[PDB]
Amino acid sequence: PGVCFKVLTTKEPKANIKRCYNLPKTNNCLKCVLFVDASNRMKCIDPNASWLAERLYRLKEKGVTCRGEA
Numbered sequence: 001p002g003v004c005f006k007v008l009t010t011k012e013p014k015a016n017i018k019r020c021y022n023l024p025k026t027n028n029c030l031k032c033v034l035f036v037d038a039s040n041r042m043k044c045i046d047p048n049a050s051w052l053a054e055r056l057y058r059l060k061e062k063g064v065t066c067r068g069e070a
Contacts, residue, residue: 001068004029005044012051013043017059022068033066 001021015037025031032044045052
């Protein structure tokens, strides 16, 4: 959450995601869905990514819901 993305991830990651957070748009940072994988790597997904809704559905089925709004 103490992060700021200026370019977004649009390719679907294969890694297992263990945490996610909805990050807000600000003057210098883009709105995106932050995925933290099992290797603790971060990718902040474009909210408009076509596959994202289904990936969020799958994550929830695996016990993972994103924190923050949107």
